[PDB]
Every structure is written in C-alpha cells, then in structure tokens.
Design a binder for this molecule. Sequence first.
Ligand SMILES: *CCC(=O)N1CCN(c2ncnc3c(F)c(-c4c(C)ccc5[nH]ncc45)c(Cl)cc23)CC1
Ligand SMILES: Nc1nc2c(ncn2[C@@H]2O[C@H](COP(=O)(O)OP(=O)(O)O)[C@@H](O)[C@H]2O)c(=O)[nH]1
Ligand SMILES: [Mg+2]
Length: 170
Amino acid sequence: GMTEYKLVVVGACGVGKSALTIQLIQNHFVDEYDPTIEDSYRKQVVIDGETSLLDILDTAGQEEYSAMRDQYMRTGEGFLLVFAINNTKSFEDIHHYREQIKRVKDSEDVPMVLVGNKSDLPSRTVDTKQAQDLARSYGIPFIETSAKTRQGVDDAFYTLVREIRKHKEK
Ligand SMILES: *CCC(=O)N1CCN(c2ncnc3c(F)c(-c4c(C)ccc5[nH]ncc45)c(Cl)cc23)CC1
Ligand SMILES: Nc1nc2c(ncn2[C@@H]2O[C@H](COP(=O)(O)OP(=O)(O)O)[C@@H](O)[C@H]2O)c(=O)[nH]1
Ligand SMILES: [Mg+2]
C-alpha cells in the first residue's frame, strides 16, 4: 500500500526552506526562488520500503494569521524547524516557530525535526552542540543539512516521516 504525509517547512526568511523543498522534489539546488511564494508540493518517494506520498507546505510571505492559514498549518502532521547555521537570529527564532505550531495544533506532542541548514558554508555561528542541546530539550531529532550539496536532505524529511509514524501509533 502507500501512506501520505503532510509535511510543513518553517523557519525565518532566507534559511533555505524553498531550497530544501526543491532539492527533495526536483533533486537539484536553486539559487533564487521567490521569497513570497507559499505553496504545497507533492512528491512520491519510498521510505523504508513503503511508497510514501509527501505533500510539503513551504511557508513564506510575512507573519500574519488568518483562518485560512491556521487551518492549513494545523493540517500539517509534522514540521521541519529550519534555521541556518550561519545565522544566529534564525536560531533564536526557532522558539517562536515551535510555540506557534503548538498553538495551532493545540498540543505539546507534535512531530518535529530541528534542521540546521547551509552546513556547506564556512562561516558557522551556531555550534552543533548548542543545537543538539536545544533539540534534546524539545525531545526531537536534530539534523544538519545543505540544500546546496544535498547533504542530509533526505535524512531530514525521512526522519520527520518516521517521527510522524511514531505519533500516529499512539
Ligand atoms: C522571507 C519570507 C519567508 O520565508 N517567511 C517565513 C514565514 N514568515 C513567518 N514569520 C514569522 N512567523 C511565522 C509564523 F508564525 C507562521 C505560522 C506558524 C509557525 C504556525 C501557525 C501559523 N498560522 N499562521 C501563520 C503560522 C508562518 Cl506560516 C510564517 C511565519 C515570514 C516570512
Ligand atoms: N550555500 C548554501 N546556500 C543556501 C542553502 N540553502 C539555501 N541557500 C541559499 O539561501 C538563500 C535563501 O534560500 P531560500 O530557499 O529562498 O530560503 P527561504 O526564504 O527559507 O525559502 C538562496 O539564495 C539560496 O540559494 C544551503 O544549504 N547552502
Ligand atoms: Mg522560500
């Protein structure tokens, strides 16, 4: 059979949400993708032997809350919390994203993965250990990725799927 998973990618402007999503759906890097485009994208893959249909919402635009947007954020089953390893502000923003997800899902038990993107870049400002400690306090996996080289990209999305599977067993 197959299973479908609704995945949502969140994080500050410019951390690489669109680049990560396009790497997964199209298997290549983009230098430039309209930062205002918020949309969902479908991709069939195979995860641990099971046909998996991923429906990936790539968030964008500006901060604002509507019934429309709360509803389609709430339909997400799991969330990638993306920061860039060379941008401390994006790391400091993760708390905001996690608390907004908890609000819209009305739950403290939401599948999430912390993603430190742009790992190919030399100018790191967020120590891997700091991100690991945060993920440990959240109870979630942490994966470092590069949308440019594709390092860790499949691992981030597939790990989120596995976190969803565990949640659905409850
Ligand atoms: C450069 C443009 C870009 O990529 N973004 C990212 C999305 N933006 C944004 N900024 C601050 N907070 C945001 C949010 F809180 C949400 C959000 C969450 C996380 C959960 C539930 C929501 N319901 N409505 C909005 C919700 C989103 Cl989707 C985006 C946020 C700025 C521009
Ligand atoms: N070197 C490098 N650049 C990246 C990476 N991911 C995204 N970018 C670049 O960072 C910028 C912002 O990426 P984008 O996907 O638009 O971020 P978004 O605002 O979160 O959707 C783009 O110029 C991308 O080419 C990465 O992993 N490594
Ligand atoms: Mg984008």
